[PDB]
Amino acid sequence: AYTNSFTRGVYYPDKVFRSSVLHS
Amino acid sequence: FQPTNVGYQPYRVVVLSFELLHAPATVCGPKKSTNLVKNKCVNFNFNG
């Protein structure tokens, strides 16, 4: 059996604080 | 290896690999810490 992930399972890529930014 | 061998002599090796991650630091040089100061302009060094 299967299911759609939607947009779940994002995680913080590094231990650095960033705010009010669209970061690649 | 025999002691009479120079490019054929045994050499001991240690390679130190240093991790400079974004994480909290873990192994420091012997540099002594000092008290924090705020609102004054300071030269600073946090974790290197």
Curated annotation (Swiss-Prot), chain B:
Cited function: Attaches the virion to the cell membrane by interacting with host receptor, initiating the infection. The major receptor is host ACE2. When S2/S2' has been cleaved, binding to the receptor triggers direct fusion at the cell membrane. When S2/S2' has not been cleaved, binding to the receptor results in internalization of the virus by endocytosis using host TFRC and GRM2 and leading to fusion of the virion membrane with the host endosomal membrane. Alternatively, may use NRP1/NRP2 and integrin as entry receptors.
Listed name of the protein: Spike protein S1
Region described as Disordered: spans on this chain: 22-44
Phenotypic consequence of Y8H: In strain: Omicron/BA.1, Omicron/BA.2, Omicron/BA.2.12.1, Omicron/BA.2.75, Omicron/BA.4, Omicron/BA.5, Omicron/BQ.1.1, Omicron/XBB.1.5, Omicron/EG.5.1
Phenotype upon changing N5T: In strain: 19B/501T
Native source species: Severe acute respiratory syndrome coronavirus 2 (2019-nCoV)
Highest taxon above the source species: Viruses
Listed result of changing N5T: Reduced host ACE2-binding affinity in vitro
Name of the coding gene: S
Subunit-level organization: Binds to host ACE2. RBD also interacts with the N-linked glycan on 'Asn-90' of ACE2. Cleavage of S generates a polybasic C-terminal sequence on S1 that binds to host Neuropilin-1 (NRP1) and Neuropilin-2 (NRP2) receptors. Interacts with host integrin alpha-5/beta-1 (ITGA5:ITGB1) and with ACE2 in complex with integrin alpha-5/beta-1 (ITGA5:ITGB1). May interact via cytoplasmic c-terminus with M protein. May interact (via N-terminus) with host bilirubin and biliverdin, thereby preventing antibody binding to the SARS-CoV-2 spike NTD via an allosteric mechanism.
